[PDB]
From a paper:
DEAH-box adenosine triphosphatases (ATPases) play a crucial role in the spliceosome-mediated excision of pre-mRNA introns. The catalytic activation, the catalysis itself as well as the final disassembly steps are driven by so-called DEAH-box helicases. They all belong to the helicase superfamily 2 (SF2) and share at least eight conserved sequence motifs (motifs I, Ia, Ib, II, III, IV, V and VI) spread over two RecA-like domains that together form the helicase core. Two RecA-like domains, referred to as RecA1 and RecA2, build up the helicase core. The RecA2 domain contains an anti-parallel β-hairpin present in all DExH-box helicases, which protrudes out of the RecA2 domain thereby contacting the C-terminal domains. These domains are divided in three distinct domains, namely the winged-helix (WH), the helix-bundle (HB) and the oligonucleotide-binding (OB) domain.
Numbering used by the authors: 60 to 762
The structure:
């Protein structure tokens, strides 16, 4: 219908065709620079491929013009169809969606929020005029829960699709299904660091449009030898650039909040020393991480300070960021990128069902994306703080997908809320193994989160609101029925983080002496509760909690994580009308209530002692032979125990163990422990004798 040549004549017009206003002089200066971008040379090739194909794979270099120009090309092409629909472009980070939408609003000569806008979690900067909306992929996924056919959008552009986050992979699977349902919906998948053929084959052998060329080069520099202290090498590199290199701002990639703020303190102190001793320029230092407020995140676009004198050494800006700034951003003024090659990446412990963060080496794709923050408006340089051979042989090509590094049972419940019926045949790009998916569906059905037809129950919908492994969420939801919901709230939070115990090899006797203060002989779960209670009591006394945790050989990081999780879980209970209850401590049933309440989440992790004096236990699930882990505080374990973690070393253990009574299993999980259909064996015979001894006693007193 409309060619690239026809659209360019409308772009050259004195009048804005979207608003009716006169085009500003800033618009024409930007348009002049935009047409020199590498993607503009293949605009008609894009439009021809967009007309004749439903799904398109787009590859071009960092800064070539993918995120800014391609949605504007679609916008000029899509308007005469009069659909009243929107164009969606998903960014990985909130700061990318806000920054790009402001830039494209300037490029279209419109006001941000009116014709170009953004939509993030707590801010919908859109209106009825909005035709192009940049957003996070999590925001589009939240919209798909209420609108499964994506009815507000005519084109959905999945940007930075190489990242393979949980939201990106799920969006790609939903949009692949929707493309067979909705032929009036276009899909564009783009990145600079993409496995193009893998993405093409996944999207029904979609065509590839590859744009070559760069606006400006990025020179890559490697170190001649490996260096362990990457923070020290990062700070040294930043100061060496400020002392010797010409004008240009620095972007430094670090891994977390505490590491960044400490490095920002160290860089500023050394800069203050270089100023008074060497006539160096001023350098402003900006931190950037996800927990920063957005107005303080936006400060990274501020101009570098002026030099101290005419002809003096240049003033400079140093941004110290996580991988929140790894992709999409155009920070004008940046010339230098420092890449230590590390990031906090999510791992999943399958034995504890705990997601946590681990400082890990980055992928080759991530290193190319970090370098691509330079070379956008001027030439750039990237200092990789690792050898060239380490780049070529030690870094993986792409980071492993998040769905294979996450709690799959949490993912299944979210997919049910998104309307996925068949989980076994849900076509993800890199699906989990069918045994792993069937294991998650089996556990969720036994936990009554999915019914026997696979459909979501009200308990499973409520459990999915909690940022927890679903067995922990079921235990928390069920805890008012055991009159100990305040203590289960604490235990659930502690079980959602890694273990708090710190036992260094040179001070293991002192660590055991501190642990014995919290030891409860009837359960490791109560020992965990005592340690958190002592942590909160010392915090209420105004004590240095980093010092307190160090002197008590506890992890301040995991304890403060659990305390922060406990506040989040307490809001969700109060929101959904779930009472916060405690039994008085001197009540005779105080501890038995908490040990009973554990079985509402963990009735499938139960072991029975084999003989009268044996140390060997047999698990209810899969009949494994185990010992009680020697780190337990349970000095005399009962015949029946509940456990948190299966441990496979040179011996097989169950860790985090609490004494239970076997009649509690029949009371709390009677469907799972239905003896009329239970698996035959020594475990069933023992539970049969327990049920018979209950029946013998109730028939006696009734007579
Ligand atoms: N905020 C901005 N300020 C100045 N120039 C910008 C800005 N955003 C984008 N540009 C220019 O437009 C180019 C293309 O940016 P963008 O479309 O985001 O690229 P891509 O997504 O392909 O990496 C940049 O390399 C730069 O030259
Ligand atoms: F590929 Be670009 F840097 F978003
Ligand atoms: Cl974000
Ligand atoms: Cl968001
Ligand atoms: Cl001074
Ligand atoms: Cl972050
Ligand atoms: Cl009950
Ligand atoms: Mg982009």
């Amino acid at each position: 219908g409309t060619t690239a040549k026809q659209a360019e004549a409308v772009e050259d017009s004195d009048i804005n065709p979207w608003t009716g206003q006169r085009h500003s002089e800033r618009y024409f200066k930007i348009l002049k620079a935009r047409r020199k971008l590498p993607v503009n040379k293949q605009r008609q090739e894009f439009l021809d491929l967009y007309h004749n194909n439903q799904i398109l794979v787009f590859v071009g270099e960092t800064g070539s013009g993918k995120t800014t120009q391609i949605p504007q090309y679609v916008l000029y092409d899509e308007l005469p169809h009069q659909t009243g629909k929107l164009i969606a472009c998903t960014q990985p980070r909130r700061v990318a969606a806000m920054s790009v939408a402001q830039r494209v609003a300037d490029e279209l000569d419109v006001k941000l929020g009116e014709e170009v806008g953004y939509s993030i979690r707590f801010e919908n900067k859109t209106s009825s005029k909005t035709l192009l909306k940049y957003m996070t992929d999590g925001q589009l996924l939240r919209e798909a829960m209420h609108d499964r056919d994506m009815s507000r959008y005519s084109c959905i552009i999945l940007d930075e699709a190489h990242e393979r986050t949980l939201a990106t992979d799920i969006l790609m699977a939903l949009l692949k299904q929707l493309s067979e349902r909705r032929k009036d919906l276009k899909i564009i998948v783009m990145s600079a660091t993409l496995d193009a053929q893998k993405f093409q084959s996944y999207f029904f052998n979609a065509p590839l449009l590859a744009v070559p060329g760069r606006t400006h080069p990025v020179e890559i520099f490697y170190t001649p030898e490996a260096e362990r202290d990457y923070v020290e090498a990062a700070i040294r590199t930043v100061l060496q650039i400020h002392a010797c290199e010409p004008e240009g701002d620095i972007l430094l990639f670090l891994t977390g909040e505490e590491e960044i703020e400490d490095a920002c303190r160290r860089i500023s102190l050394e800069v203050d020393e270089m100023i008074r001793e060497s006539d160096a320029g001023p350098m402003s230092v900006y931190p950037l991480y996800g927990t920063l407020p957005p107005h303080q995140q936006q400060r990274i676009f501020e101009k570098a300070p002026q030099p101290f004198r005419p002809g003096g050494r240049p003033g400079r800006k140093c941004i110290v960021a996580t991988n929140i700034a790894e992709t999409a951003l155009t920070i004008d003024g940046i010339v230098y990128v420092v890449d230590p090659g590390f990031s906090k990446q999510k791992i999943y412990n399958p034995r504890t069902r705990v997601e946590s963060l681990l400082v890990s080496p980055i992928s080759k794709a991530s290193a190319q994306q970090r370098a691509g923050r330079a070379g956008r408006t001027r030439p750039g340089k990237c200092f990789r703080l690792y050898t060239e051979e380490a780049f070529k042989k030690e870094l993986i090509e792409q980071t492993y997908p998040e769905i294979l590094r996450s709690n799959l049972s949490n993912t299944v419940l979210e997919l049910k809320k998104l309307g996925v019926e068949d989980l076994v045949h849900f076509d993800l790009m890199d699906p989990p193994a069918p045994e792993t998916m069937m294991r998650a569906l089996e556990e969720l059905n036994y936990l009554a989160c999915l019914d026997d037809d696979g459909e979501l129950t009200p308990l499973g919908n409520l459990a999915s609101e909690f940022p927890l492994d679903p067995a922990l969420a079921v235990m928390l939801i069920s805890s008012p029925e055991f009159y100990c919901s305040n203590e289960i709230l604490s235990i659930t939070s502690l079980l959602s983080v890694p273990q708090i115990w710190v036992r260094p090899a040179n001070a293991r006797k002192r660590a055991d002496e501190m642990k014995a203060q919290f030891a409860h002989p009837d359960g490791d779960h109560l020992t965990l509760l005592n340690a958190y209670h002592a942590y909160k009591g010392a915090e209420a006394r105004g004590e240095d909690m980093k010092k307190w945790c160090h002197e008590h050989f506890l992890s301040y990081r995991h304890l403060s994580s659990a305390d922060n999780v406990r506040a989040q879980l307490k809001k969700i209970m109060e929101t959904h009308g779930i009472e916060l209850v405690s039994t008085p401590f001197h009540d005779k049933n105080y501890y038995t209530n908490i040990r009973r309440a554990l079985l509402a989440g963990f009735f499938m992790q139960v072991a029975m002692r084999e003989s009268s004096n044996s140390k060997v236990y047999k698990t209810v699930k899969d009949e494994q032979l185990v010992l009680i882990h020697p780190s337990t505080t349970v000095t005399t374990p009962y015949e029946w125990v509940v456990y948190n973690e299966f441990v496979l070393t040179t011996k097989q253990y169950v860790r985090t163990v609490t004494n239970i009574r076997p009649e509690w299993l029949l009371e709390i999980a009677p469907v799972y422990y239905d003896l009329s259909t239970f698996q035959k064996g020594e475990i069933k015979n023992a539970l049969t004798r327990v049920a018979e001894k209950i029946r013998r006693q109730q028939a006696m007193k009734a007579s």
